[PDB]
Amino acid sequence: PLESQYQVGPLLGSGGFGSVYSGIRVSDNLPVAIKHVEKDRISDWGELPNGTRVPMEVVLLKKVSSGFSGVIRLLDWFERPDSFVLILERPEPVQDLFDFITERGALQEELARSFFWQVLEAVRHCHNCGVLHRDIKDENILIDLNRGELKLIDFGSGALLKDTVYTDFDGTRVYSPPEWIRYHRYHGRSAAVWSLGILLYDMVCGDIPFEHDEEIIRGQVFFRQRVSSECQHLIRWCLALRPSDRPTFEEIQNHPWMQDVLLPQETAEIHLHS
């Protein structure tokens, strides 16, 4: 135990999630990302399937770990007197969807379809494991540039998935649905589908559709780029004002705009340069 186990490199980012460094696991040079979270900044704690007090983040990552690579894996974690330290996987090379979209502007539909599908798979995977992510957005998605695979990251606002109403939220306001804004109430699935609608708008227009509580409440969608009618229809569907009018994941993945998706390897060859 302790970090002669890892070799710390450059800082990768910091913000509401804490501080994430690039790292290398010494015993086999596996790339890793080392995430430090302050105890003071952790409102949400859980208990391991076997005993102790840990941040909910850790509970949730334990629940979503598997061979499936569409969600980031937690490799290990350590406690410290004032902080927790998570060791997570790190694809290489890599770039977040926010930078990628900042670089290339609005994405061609074929590449947005392939990215959005993989997100849909990642999110289904998390619902399956009893975990609701609650902060789906471009900044919380990583692209493994070689294989063309996306990884959902940053479970720091997640909660156990439940079928009753949520009355707390600490994800990202511009991705939160109308019923959270007006009532401070949402159900998990349907709030997830709305954030997915924001996400898809973002990929295909190059920016999020709504900046202010006003526009969220009203949910009128203006498209600023050429975007096909089938893609516009899917987006307006995810963004139905009434939660019960939103599509299920099955209905999203059966949408005509979602047919004939590229494989990740295909996606990198054609769109990322392999």
Task: Please list the residues that pair with 6 across neighbouring strands.
Answer: 25
15 carries a ligand binding annotation: yes
Q: Verify cis geometry, omega within 30 degrees of 0, for the bond prior to 264.
A: no
DSSP label at 107?
P
Please, which residue, 143 or 240, has the CB nearer to ligand UNE? 143
**Binding window for ligand UNE (CB under 6 A); candidates: 86-94, 128-136, 163-171, 261-269:** 86-94
Site for ligand UNE in 88-107 (CB under 6 A): 88, 90, 94
Please, which residue, 18 or 178, has the CB nearer to ligand UNE? 18
Instruction: Pick one of 5, 12, 36, 215: the residue that binds ligand UNE (CB under 6 A).
Output: 12
Distance of CA 158 to the CA centre of its chain: 10
Q: Specify the pairing of strand 149-152 against strand 141-144.
A: antiparallel
Rounded distance between C-alpha atoms, residue 210 and residue 76, angstroms: 38
Place of tokens 């927790």: 84
Site string for ligand UNE, 140-159 (x = CB under 6 A): -------------xx-----
19 carries a ligand binding annotation: yes
DSSP label at 51?
S
Site string for ligand UNE, 21-60 (x = CB under 6 A): ------------x-x-------------------------
Q: Are 6 and 77 in contact (CB under 8 A)?
A: no
Catalytic residue among 40, 135, 138, 260: 135
Q: In residues, how long is the chain?
A: 274
**Binding window for ligand UNE (CB under 6 A); candidates: 10-18, 47-55, 211-219, 255-263:** 10-18
Q: Which candidate, 123, 126, 117, 106, places its Cα nearest to that of 149?
A: 117
12 carries a ligand binding annotation: yes
Residue 121 exposed, middle or buried by CB count within 10 Å (0-12, 13-18, 19+): middle
Please, which residue, 88 or 97, has the CB nearer to ligand UNE? 88
Site for ligand UNE in 120-139 (CB under 6 A): none
Rounded distance between C-alpha atoms, residue 130 and residue 67, angstroms: 17
Q: Catalytic residue at 40?
A: no
**Shortest distance (Å) from residue 152 CB to ligand UNE:** 9
Residue ranges in contact with ligand UNE by CB under 6 A: 12-13, 17, 20, 33, 35, 72, 88, 90, 94, 153-154
Annotated binding-site members for ATP:
12-20, 35, 89, 96
Q: Which residues are catalytic?
A: 135
